[PDB]
Design an enzyme around this catalytic site. Structure first.
Site, mmCIF file in Angstrom:
data_model
loop_
_atom_site.group_PDB
_atom_site.id
_atom_site.type_symbol
_atom_site.label_atom_id
_atom_site.label_comp_id
_atom_site.label_asym_id
_atom_site.label_seq_id
_atom_site.Cartn_x
_atom_site.Cartn_y
_atom_site.Cartn_z
ATOM 1 N N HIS A 1 10.285 -8.785 2.915
ATOM 2 C CA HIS A 1 9.886 -7.864 3.963
ATOM 3 C C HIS A 1 9.780 -8.512 5.327
ATOM 4 O O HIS A 1 9.614 -7.817 6.322
ATOM 5 C CB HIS A 1 8.562 -7.178 3.610
ATOM 6 C CG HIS A 1 7.345 -7.966 3.979
ATOM 7 N ND1 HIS A 1 6.685 -8.782 3.082
ATOM 8 C CD2 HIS A 1 6.642 -8.037 5.134
ATOM 9 C CE1 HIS A 1 5.629 -9.319 3.668
ATOM 10 N NE2 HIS A 1 5.581 -8.884 4.916
ATOM 11 N N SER B 1 2.454 -14.065 5.865
ATOM 12 C CA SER B 1 3.428 -13.452 4.963
ATOM 13 C C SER B 1 4.725 -14.243 4.823
ATOM 14 O O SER B 1 5.296 -14.688 5.812
ATOM 15 C CB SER B 1 3.742 -12.022 5.428
ATOM 16 O OG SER B 1 2.584 -11.373 5.934
HETATM 17 C C1 RPR Z 1 -4.336 -7.030 9.509
HETATM 18 O O1 RPR Z 1 -3.763 -6.544 8.286
HETATM 19 C C2 RPR Z 1 -2.749 -7.303 7.628
HETATM 20 O O2 RPR Z 1 -2.361 -8.360 8.041
HETATM 21 C C3 RPR Z 1 -2.138 -6.542 6.420
HETATM 22 C C4 RPR Z 1 -0.910 -7.327 5.829
HETATM 23 C C5 RPR Z 1 -1.192 -8.610 5.060
HETATM 24 C C6 RPR Z 1 -0.214 -9.638 5.080
HETATM 25 C C7 RPR Z 1 -0.419 -10.846 4.386
HETATM 26 C C8 RPR Z 1 -1.608 -11.049 3.660
HETATM 27 C C9 RPR Z 1 -2.604 -10.037 3.622
HETATM 28 C C10 RPR Z 1 -3.841 -10.255 2.865
HETATM 29 N N1 RPR Z 1 -4.966 -9.611 3.212
HETATM 30 N N2 RPR Z 1 -3.863 -11.104 1.819
HETATM 31 C C11 RPR Z 1 -2.389 -8.824 4.324
HETATM 32 C C12 RPR Z 1 -1.712 -5.102 6.897
HETATM 33 C C13 RPR Z 1 -0.667 -5.129 8.024
HETATM 34 N N3 RPR Z 1 -1.143 -4.369 5.759
HETATM 35 C C14 RPR Z 1 -1.865 -3.481 4.994
HETATM 36 O O3 RPR Z 1 -3.056 -3.246 5.225
HETATM 37 C C15 RPR Z 1 -1.120 -2.838 3.876
HETATM 38 C C16 RPR Z 1 -0.004 -3.485 3.270
HETATM 39 C C17 RPR Z 1 0.700 -2.874 2.207
HETATM 40 C C18 RPR Z 1 0.328 -1.600 1.703
HETATM 41 C C19 RPR Z 1 1.095 -0.960 0.563
HETATM 42 C C20 RPR Z 1 1.372 -1.677 -0.628
HETATM 43 C C21 RPR Z 1 2.091 -1.096 -1.703
HETATM 44 C C22 RPR Z 1 2.553 0.238 -1.608
HETATM 45 C C23 RPR Z 1 2.289 0.979 -0.424
HETATM 46 C C24 RPR Z 1 2.770 2.398 -0.301
HETATM 47 N N4 RPR Z 1 3.906 2.498 0.622
HETATM 48 C C25 RPR Z 1 1.563 0.375 0.650
HETATM 49 C C26 RPR Z 1 -0.781 -0.953 2.303
HETATM 50 C C27 RPR Z 1 -1.499 -1.554 3.373
#
Ligand code: RPR
Ligand code: CA
Lengths: 51, 234
Positions: free
Chosen positions: B42, B185
């Site tokens: 991704h 990520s």
């Molecule tokens: C500020 O917030 C962040 O950065 C995180 C991303 C992120 C990246 C890397 C690590 C972590 C973590 N907390 N371990 C989190 C934010 C941008 N992302 C999310 O909320 C988030 C990410 C995926 C889904 C999701 C997953 C599966 C199916 C679907 C259905 N379509 C949605 C839902 C919400």
């Protein structure tokens, strides 16, 4: 066997024929004791660099 | 990385960083060998042209061990589906080989069975990167590393608002404010066994960062060992 203490191997362990068999990652060579893994070069994988 | 620790000199040498034309890092990666980088599938959507930087620990200056590498081929997983975050894995072939040195070395690829039975049964794992230090903050300037406990598959399947596929696993804390975050990520999740670090996961996602009752989701590397092998051979 491999479930005792990883079979006394440094890395990979397999329970072939009711016995333990060790092996290593790419860039390593199994020691003569057939358990330890010896790095083949200067920067073997998985090792923190403390030149 | 939230609530982590600074990667000290030569502590996280398998860490790579994907940078956009603006030279801004936007995702992590793991050095697999001289020519290959392991990253999240991704991440290939957040840029039209990117390069890989290794040997970096402080985007603020230049220590020297750093090296930028152009990408020759990017191998994205065929079954990766944006919507479900399933099959979140990709491999990058570099145009020129990475020259291992201080702060620049590969991570070991384990054997599936042994890994899942011995590595993923370990108490802790290590995740690192230049991602946010807080959920709503800016990207980190110093490479950080965090010790994240392996989370029980069922309690993790239960905490998540979304389907945890067979190609993902959980790690982190339920309430403790430590967890990967945006920018980390594609980064490395590694497990130490007798002072040797093996690639066990790829920083994938999570709902926000370090939220109470929510964990960190990682691509299950051990499930793609065969695929990574084929990718690195062609
Ligand atoms: C500020 O917030 C962040 O950065 C995180 C991303 C992120 C990246 C890397 C690590 C972590 C973590 N907390 N371990 C989190 C934010 C941008 N992302 C999310 O909320 C988030 C990410 C995926 C889904 C999701 C997953 C599966 C199916 C679907 C259905 N379509 C949605 C839902 C919400
Ligand atoms: Ca630097």
């Amino acid at each position: 066997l491999c479930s005792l203490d990883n079979g006394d191997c440094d890395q990979f362990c397999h329970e072939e024929q009711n016995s333990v068999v060790c092996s290593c990652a790419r860039g390593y060579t199994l020691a003569d004791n057939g358990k330890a893994c010896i790095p083949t070069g200067p920067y073997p994988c998985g090792k923190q660099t403390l030149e | 990385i939230v609530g982590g620790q600074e990667c000290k000199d030569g502590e996280c040498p398998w860490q790579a960083l994907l940078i956009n034309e603006e030279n801004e890092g936007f995702c992590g990666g793991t050095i697999l060998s001289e020519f290959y980088i392991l990253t999240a599938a991704h991440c290939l959507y957040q840029a039209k042209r990117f390069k890989v930087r290794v040997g970096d620990r402080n985007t603020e200056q230049e220590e020297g061990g750093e090296a930028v590498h152009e990408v020759e081929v990017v191998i994205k997983h065929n079954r990766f589906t944006k919507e479900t975050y399933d099959f979140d894995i990709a491999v990058l072939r570099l145009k020129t080989p990475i020259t291992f040195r201080m702060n620049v070395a590969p991570a070991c690829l384990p054997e599936r069975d042994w890994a899942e039975s011995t590595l993923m049964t370990q108490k802790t794992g290590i995740v690192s990167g230049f991602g946010r230090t807080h959920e709503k903050g800016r990207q980190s300037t110093r490479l950080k590393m965090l010790e994240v406990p392996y989370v029980d598959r069922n309690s993790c399947k239960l905490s998540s608002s979304f389907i945890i596929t067979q190609n993902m696993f959980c790690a982190g804390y339920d309430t403790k404010q430590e967890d990967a975050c945006q920018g980390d990520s594609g980064g490395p999740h590694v497990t130490r066994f007798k002072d040797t670090y093996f690639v066990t996961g790829i920083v994938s996602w999570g709902e926000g960062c370090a939220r109470k009752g929510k964990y960190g989701i990682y691509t299950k590397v051990t499930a793609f060992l065969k695929w990574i092998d084929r990718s690195m051979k062609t």
